[PDB]
Design a protein around this ligand. Sequence first.
Ligand SMILES: *C[C@@](*)(O)[C@H](CCCNC(N)=[NH2+])NC(=O)[C@H](Cc1ccccc1)NC(=O)[C@@H](Cc1ccccc1)NC(C)=O
Ligand SMILES: *[C@@H]1O[C@H](CO)[C@@H](O)[C@H](O[C@H]2OC[C@@H](O)[C@H](O[C@H]3OC[C@@H](O)[C@H](O)[C@H]3O)[C@H]2O)[C@H]1O
Ligand SMILES: *[C@@H]1O[C@@H](C)[C@@H](O)[C@@H](O)[C@@H]1O
Ligand SMILES: C[N+](C)(C)C
Ligand SMILES: C[N+](C)(C)C
Ligand SMILES: C[N+](C)(C)C
Ligand SMILES: C[N+](C)(C)C
Ligand SMILES: C[N+](C)(C)C
Ligand SMILES: C[N+](C)(C)C
Ligand SMILES: C[N+](C)(C)C
Ligand SMILES: C[N+](C)(C)C
Ligand SMILES: C[N+](C)(C)C
Ligand SMILES: C[N+](C)(C)C
Ligand SMILES: C[N+](C)(C)C
Ligand SMILES: C[N+](C)(C)C
Ligand SMILES: C[N+](C)(C)C
Ligand SMILES: C[N+](C)(C)C
Ligand SMILES: C[N+](C)(C)C
Ligand SMILES: C[N+](C)(C)C
Ligand SMILES: C[N+](C)(C)C
Ligand SMILES: C[N+](C)(C)C
Ligand SMILES: C[N+](C)(C)C
Ligand SMILES: C[N+](C)(C)C
Ligand SMILES: C[N+](C)(C)C
Ligand SMILES: C[N+](C)(C)C
Ligand SMILES: [Ca+2]
Ligand SMILES: [Ca+2]
Ligand SMILES: [Ca+2]
Ligand SMILES: [Ca+2]
Ligand SMILES: [Ca+2]
Ligand SMILES: [Ca+2]
Ligand SMILES: [Ca+2]
Ligand SMILES: [Ca+2]
Ligand SMILES: [Ca+2]
Lengths: 210, 249, 143
Amino acid sequence: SGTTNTVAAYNLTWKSTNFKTILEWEPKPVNQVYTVQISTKSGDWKSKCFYTTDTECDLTDEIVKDVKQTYLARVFSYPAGNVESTGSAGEPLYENSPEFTPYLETNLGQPTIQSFEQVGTKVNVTVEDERTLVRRNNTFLSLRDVFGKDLIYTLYYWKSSSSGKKTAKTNTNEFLIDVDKGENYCFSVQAVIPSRTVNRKSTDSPVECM
Amino acid sequence: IVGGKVCPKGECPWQVLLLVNGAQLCGGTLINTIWVVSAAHCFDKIKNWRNLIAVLGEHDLSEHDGDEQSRRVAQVIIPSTYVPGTTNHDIALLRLHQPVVLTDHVVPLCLPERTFSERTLAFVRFSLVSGWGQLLDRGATALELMVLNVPRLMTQDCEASFPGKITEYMFCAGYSDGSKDSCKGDSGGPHATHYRGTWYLTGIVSWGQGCATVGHFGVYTRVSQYIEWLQKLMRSEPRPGVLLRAPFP
Amino acid sequence: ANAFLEELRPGSLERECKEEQCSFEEAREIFKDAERTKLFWISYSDGDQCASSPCQNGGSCKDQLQSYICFCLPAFEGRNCETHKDDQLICVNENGGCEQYCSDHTGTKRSCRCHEGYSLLADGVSCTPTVEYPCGKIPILEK
Ligand SMILES: *C[C@@](*)(O)[C@H](CCCNC(N)=[NH2+])NC(=O)[C@H](Cc1ccccc1)NC(=O)[C@@H](Cc1ccccc1)NC(C)=O
Ligand SMILES: *[C@@H]1O[C@H](CO)[C@@H](O)[C@H](O[C@H]2OC[C@@H](O)[C@H](O[C@H]3OC[C@@H](O)[C@H](O)[C@H]3O)[C@H]2O)[C@H]1O
Ligand SMILES: *[C@@H]1O[C@@H](C)[C@@H](O)[C@@H](O)[C@@H]1O
Ligand SMILES: C[N+](C)(C)C
Ligand SMILES: C[N+](C)(C)C
Ligand SMILES: C[N+](C)(C)C
Ligand SMILES: C[N+](C)(C)C
Ligand SMILES: C[N+](C)(C)C
Ligand SMILES: C[N+](C)(C)C
Ligand SMILES: C[N+](C)(C)C
Ligand SMILES: C[N+](C)(C)C
Ligand SMILES: C[N+](C)(C)C
Ligand SMILES: C[N+](C)(C)C
Ligand SMILES: C[N+](C)(C)C
Ligand SMILES: C[N+](C)(C)C
Ligand SMILES: C[N+](C)(C)C
Ligand SMILES: C[N+](C)(C)C
Ligand SMILES: C[N+](C)(C)C
Ligand SMILES: C[N+](C)(C)C
Ligand SMILES: C[N+](C)(C)C
Ligand SMILES: C[N+](C)(C)C
Ligand SMILES: C[N+](C)(C)C
Ligand SMILES: C[N+](C)(C)C
Ligand SMILES: C[N+](C)(C)C
Ligand SMILES: C[N+](C)(C)C
Ligand SMILES: [Ca+2]
Ligand SMILES: [Ca+2]
Ligand SMILES: [Ca+2]
Ligand SMILES: [Ca+2]
Ligand SMILES: [Ca+2]
Ligand SMILES: [Ca+2]
Ligand SMILES: [Ca+2]
Ligand SMILES: [Ca+2]
Ligand SMILES: [Ca+2]
């Protein structure tokens, strides 16, 4: 392959958490550099990450313009040090990404228990409503802002003094649970979008204990 | 045009109708008051050169409303690399015998710079294609000018549809789901691309496999390859002859 | 952490893992159960991937499991906020912001140009007609 001027990218992969969305690919730049394009399925192609040695391209700011759209990306290869040499049709070699629909596919980040508060046999447990990369006007929207009613949380909790786990679920960021007096409980939560078919759940939060 | 709609009168003002002996032949695209771009293959069967007419400002072929302007074609210029009956280099530049008058109904389409066309226009997804050609494959031609928005493919994405058949002088556009396409009789008409408020010529209706055939796209002459060729000819001292072959590149 | 004689005392998550760094067995002396200890440990031992300050240009870092996310200021993008959005002014980038034609030059800012029948406006990027029927406009709609 000494006679090759470029080779197409491959293994194009979407890495996305809380809407922070980066396309990655192979190979490492070998006598070539890359440019990415992204479009919605029926929209115009916009170029990003021009003539780069990176094997990644942040596409967050494009996909957050409408998280419910489905996006297509492609990665072009250019001969290094001769990037305008793309053949007479003006079409460099490229590869197409999988389709990506952010609302459905971005991973839920690891949640955090913000606080808990006990009065007698009752405890409130509150989950942080953390920020996403989606902007509205001059501000980042929270997970609840983006997902609304599509987002729930699940609580796993246990008494230190007994085996067995208990669970609860909430439509908001808060749980109100009954507990036995005189026992120290511990807690972990997960974010869930029940309507999803894939990537439905976050990883477990850190554990917090009375 | 298959799956299109009527282009309201004056909204496709660079469209040309070509007639031979008064019968409908092909489309074309006005690029200034004396020059029309069409497809070379429109001329593969002509013998009556004296009766080739271009009509500007046309809309409804059943009635002359007054906005039509008719011109004898003085010269048809085709690439030296064009071979009748073969798809490559399917472009012709036509010199009108007398200039047309630009009006609300007759306006040229911009012939873009090549680099702009390759770097920028090629990545506008949808473009308009228009003509009076067949409404269905093997069907009837249209009485009112029809227009359709079609999305463009890079050749790698069209390769599987036409393996080894799409040259650098062509590109594909359309829908492989079969709904919509240009068709026979639309040849020579514009594939026109909008960018930031102005319309530019990016393709010429050229060929396909049937029309609106599942799995297949329309194939258009890649005008970006011909911008210099066209410009040089429009500047050149005229040569005699109704059909002229001009060196390409 | 373990100092001499501390381990005579009952375990305490606050004293041993919050106020001090605890080892897995110290954490296990607290939770007792293997699976519960594991669930604590996977987060506790992960570390703060933001401690290396990976977010550039005034961005803000949010730690994750074995990863982080950078929230950028509006003028920046990238995994690490390393890309300035206003600083790739080349013709292949949205036409250099030019309305019509764009030229890259060696040693100067890109220039914008206009097609015959138009002229470049003062803003350096827009074009306006200089003739009655410029190419590529639809006069019947612009009336
Ligand atoms: C002349 C045009 O009016 C017409 C346009 C067809 C667009 N079709 C589409 N699906 N968008 N073009 C032809 O009929 C074309 C003629 C031709 C073109 C270039 C060189 C020579 C002739 N023929 C075809 O499209 C034809 C395929 C073909 C092309 C060239 C040579 C042989 C066969 N397809 C047919 C018939 O289905
Ligand atoms: C400390 O700062 C340096 C930069 O100076 C970073 O390279 C370090 O981050 C790297 O190593 C830790 C990884 O967790 C991290 O990659 C993960 O998190 C960032 C995500 O964008 C990525 O997908 C994920 O693999 C890596 O970038 C930093 O800790
Ligand atoms: C974190 O978020 C980013 C966007 C900036 O606003 C920083 O100042 C902040 O701490
Ligand atoms: C690389 N791929 C898993 C996205 C196909
Ligand atoms: C790394 N990330 C893209 C998952 C944010
Ligand atoms: C643009 N496309 C949806 C027709 C593929
Ligand atoms: C291409 N580069 C921005 C990574 C240097
Ligand atoms: C590459 N793909 C869009 C066909 C999945
Ligand atoms: C303490 N708070 C989390 C309930 C606000
Ligand atoms: C889509 N939704 C956020 C409005 C539920
Ligand atoms: C049991 N679980 C907390 C790991 C979900
Ligand atoms: C506040 N809430 C937990 C009762 C919903
Ligand atoms: C076991 N713990 C509740 C004391 C943390
Ligand atoms: C010739 N005519 C059909 C326009 C009447
Ligand atoms: C024939 N005519 C349309 C020019 C009047
Ligand atoms: C058609 N024309 C010869 C009258 C111009
Ligand atoms: C003769 N050809 C149509 C096969 C090119
Ligand atoms: C001639 N053809 C193979 C393009 C149909
Ligand atoms: C990004 N591209 C214009 C070079 C194809
Ligand atoms: C007309 N369009 C929906 C194809 C854009
Ligand atoms: C070659 N292709 C996979 C991009 C179509
Ligand atoms: C799926 N197909 C209709 C394109 C064949
Ligand atoms: C497709 N377009 C008419 C919006 C340019
Ligand atoms: C003995 N003790 C440390 C377990 C309390
Ligand atoms: C911040 N944290 C989610 C990593 C705990
Ligand atoms: Ca008429
Ligand atoms: Ca200690
Ligand atoms: Ca200890
Ligand atoms: Ca201990
Ligand atoms: Ca201590
Ligand atoms: Ca303390
Ligand atoms: Ca111990
Ligand atoms: Ca022990
Ligand atoms: Ca971490």
